[PDB]
Design a protein around this ligand. Structure first.
Ligand code: NDP
Ligand code: NDP
Ligand code: ZN
Ligand code: ZN
Lengths: 357, 357
């Protein structure tokens, strides 16, 4: 079978061949339909070759997959089922409490593999296998954009934990502010528009010049574009209003600190960004006091699990068609896959199509 | 009646006289039994005279009161009821959503008064009044140490919010680390010992040399004393273990930052400290990434309300007698009240006795 991979010492994704996998007990064989490209794929391609599987020359890319079950094997799935795989699998040493308790998304460093990211091949091959417990059935009509279910699920989990932080009181948020205009930020912005919390005012932070398709999406969702070069996060309460909810998706460390200042009393920041170490001058006293005197929270979140993938299917149905059309800037056949790894301002979410149903 | 107050331009608490208050509709008249002294009382005495009531020459001190109802007026309380007052009352402009929804503890700055702290006289007078809704009945045998109910309630709320942050998954903490060996830290340490979470290992951070009565309390509770001069917060995972729960009660801004590093994956820090602005070099990138990759939370908490005072009475019953004996270093009759404002290492929790039942 064909697969798209990064090889050791190389700086580009390429087509390789490897045998079609065979499902072990409790696993189904899946024919890959479409796989989304993400920042993490770009990070692997950049020179992050520490994530390769034990004793292997390459890493198959892609962790945002949708496929069709072609061999249900000894599982309870049926042939023809449209499924999305979860990302996390047990590490080398085998299972642990996180996997046993059906919460591998809460497993710490070294206690999981992530397919297409660290320790395990991804989904950008014509076929893959997975335990039935990690295959989430989705509605058949979500096959076309099914590669979106995984990133939606990231937000489903983050919101679940952030909202849990506020559950000891009657929290009544009216404003939400997404930091970041990548596909995650933009997905989250549309999600917050359909959120039960009934947000009145939505904002999204970026740093683009017009004309820009992320600005257009933000504005078409009836949200305010906040150009950080004009109005930084801490200035936002002056220029706009205090934000009950902040969802951080920039990976900018200053935003973790400054979100505390931009928050309304009793608000929560969800942090999703993954920055490298970076030291600079912080008014920790103001950070600390503001958290306390105004009963604020910061909640970090990573990965997601089955419940979040199921929630994502419901959320998907509520997402506007125009939005899905504009968010997905290109689906590329495997024949011309290289275009999927385009990275520029007009490129929002791409995917590679391996087959059709 | 007699009261203990700070007057404008003066640097010491003194006895004053003012008329006995008369209960308005919905209020009871209370005879003050005992009032605890806290750090906030010391801060008022220091030169924080911005908290005085509108157009008044003095602030009556004390916010940790226990008393006996002597006139139930038109309320549902009975004469002889032992009660503890909540601290927060409506601001000048009158009621608001926080007060209306029975959550004034979540009111932001300027939207409340705190009796004995800002905008309203405290409880260090022979008599006081309060709405029945802010008077919490407690068991009669808690009259002697009833001034402890308010600070216990501070922790009851903080734990409620911190634990709420962890409620989206099956959190199974085994370790807890209290930062601070003031009366709040020590109360919290004994509370975490009787907490349903069933903590296996307890730690408390201080910076005292032996012999010291706070060290003795920590060790007698079967907790580990962590001298920050030896093992700072960030070093604690090396020397000891990663902490599932951290309760910050130092008011040291570095501890807000460093608690993130000392936390176990999926852990939460409660912040209670109130520092002034203080800027210094922080590795914000490491702070940010650690929050996210390891699904951690920070939750700030201030004040408390009726539900927390009720919970505090239950917790009180579970507290060891030796602990209560050792925690309360002096109860001083009003006649010799000055000793209550002693502030040294052997002084833990003091109170002033205005009357007996
Ligand atoms: N915790 C988790 O499970 C997950 C975490 N992530 C992380 O979340 C973050 C967002 O993911 P994704 O949206 O896909 O990644 P992107 O890098 O594509 O999105 C980040 C966006 O933030 C913008 N940005 C960065 N700094 C600033 C700033 N100072 N002011 C205004 N805008 C800024 C960038 O704008 P510009 O292009 O103009 O520079 C970019 O469009 C990343 O750090 C990623 O690592 C992603 C997926 C899951
Ligand atoms: N949010 C809320 O509702 C409430 C907040 N507070 C706040 O919580 C904090 C604790 O209250 P309380 O216990 O009564 O106050 P204390 O000041 O009496 O307690 C703080 C303790 O922390 C210790 N400490 C300070 N810095 C360090 C450090 N670097 N290393 C080790 N120990 C340190 C001090 O030790 P030492 O004496 O040796 O210097 C002191 O014993 C205060 O900041 C207070 O303002 C208090 C009540 C309610
Ligand atoms: Zn993804
Ligand atoms: Zn108190």
């Amino acid at each position: 079978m064909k697969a798209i991979a990064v090889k050791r010492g190389e700086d580009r994704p390429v087509v390789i061949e490897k045998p079609r996998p065979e499902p072990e007990s409790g696993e189904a064989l899946v024919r890959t339909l479409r796989v989304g490209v993400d920042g993490t794929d770009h990070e692997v391609i950049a020179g992050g070759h520490g994530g390769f599987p034990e004793g292997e020359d390459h890493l198959v890319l892609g962790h945002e997959a949708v496929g069709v079950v072609v061999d249900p094997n000894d599982t309870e799935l049926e042939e023809g089922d449209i499924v999305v795989p979860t990302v996390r699998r047990p590490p080398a040493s085998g299972t642990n409490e996180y996997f046993e308790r059906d919460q591998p998304d809460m497993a710490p460093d070294g206690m999981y593999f992530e397919r297409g990211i660290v320790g395990a091949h991804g989904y950008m091959s014509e076929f893959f296998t997975s335990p039935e417990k990690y295959l989430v059935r989705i509605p058949r009509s979500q096959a076309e954009l099914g590669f979106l279910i995984e990133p939606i699920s990231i937000t489903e989990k983050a919101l679940e934990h952030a909202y849990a932080s506020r559950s000891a009181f009657d929290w009544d948020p009216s404003s939400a502010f997404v930091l970041g205009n990548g596909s995650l930020g933009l997905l989250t912005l549309a999600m917050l528009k359909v959120d039960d919390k009934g947000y009145e005012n939505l904002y999204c932070l970026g740093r683009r010049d017009r004309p820009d398709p992320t600005i257009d999406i933000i504005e078409e969702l009836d949200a305010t574009y906040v150009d950080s070069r004009q109005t930084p996060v801490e200035d936002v309460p002056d220029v706009y209003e205090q934000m009950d909810f902040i969802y951080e998706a920039t990976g900018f460390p200053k935003h973790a600190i400054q979100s505390v200042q931009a928050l309304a009393p009793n608000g929560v920041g969800a942090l999703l960004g993954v920055p490298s170490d970076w030291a600079f001058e912080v008014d920790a006293g103001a950070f600390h006091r503001e958290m306390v005197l105004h009963n604020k929270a910061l909640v970090g979140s990573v990965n997601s699990h089955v419940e979040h993938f199921e929630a994502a299917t419901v959320t998907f149905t509520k997402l506007p068609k125009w939005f899905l059309e504009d968010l997905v800037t290109g689906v590329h056949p495997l024949s011309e896959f290289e275009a999927a790894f385009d990275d520029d301002d007009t490129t929002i979410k791409t995917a590679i199509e391996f087959s059709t149903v």
